[PDB]
């Protein structure tokens, strides 16, 4: 009865909520396509992994048609 | 009497001055083909184990 299969859950979503201290270059969001994007000091790589380019706090902005970005404001 | 240092152990692990068991990374010697340079490099490393790491030190000691 070919029907007993499924995929090793990849455990995605955001991993650092707005207002949170992030160290130099740790991960923020592991997403499917483009539910999120880079932002002030927020690079990403092949799988669409948003992370920090510096330390500082994480924050979530909402720009309708333009989508959703997630950036970090640092303190130095 | 007089336990034997597991030979198959020491032939692939070394225990450090501190006491943590350093081990050789697995996944490079066969799976290869065109594994991104970034691959076969990050594999050339050694590293640490954990809870089995303590099982290891149990297998030697005379050494």
């Amino acid at each position: 009865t070919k029907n007993g299969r499924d995929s090793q859950a990849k455990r995605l979503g955001v991993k650092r909520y707005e207002g949170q201290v992030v160290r130099a270059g740790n991960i923020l969001v592991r997403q499917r396509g483009t539910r999120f994007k880079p932002g002030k000091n927020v690079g990403m790589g092949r799988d669409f992994t948003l992370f920090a380019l510096v330390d500082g706090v994480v924050e979530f902005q909402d720009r309708g048609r333009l989508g959703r970005y997630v950036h970090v404001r640092p303190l130095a | 009497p007089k336990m034997k240092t597991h030979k198959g152990a020491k032939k692939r692990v070394k225990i450090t001055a501190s006491g943590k068991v350093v081990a050789m990374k697995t996944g490079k010697r066969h799976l290869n083909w065109q594994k991104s340079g970034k691959e076969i490099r990050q594999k050339g490393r050694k590293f640490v184990l954990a809870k089995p790491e303590a099982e290891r030190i149990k297998l030697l000691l005379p050494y």
Binding site: - | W33, Q34, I40
Partner: protein, 44 residues
């Protein structure tokens, strides 16, 4: 196919992939050998 390119004037190598049938008869791409810096390579 499974392929590894070799260096001219020497014998360096690198990881690669051939395709045979499709447009892949000749293969002389550039790289970055160790002994010195930068030269051409081959097939087989």
């Amino acid at each position: 196919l499974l392929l590894e390119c070799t260096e001219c004037k020497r014998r360096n190598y690198a990881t690669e992939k051939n395709k045979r049938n499709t447009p892949n008869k000749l293969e002389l791409r550039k790289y970055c050998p160790w002994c010195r810096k930068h030269t051409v390579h081959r097939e087989v």
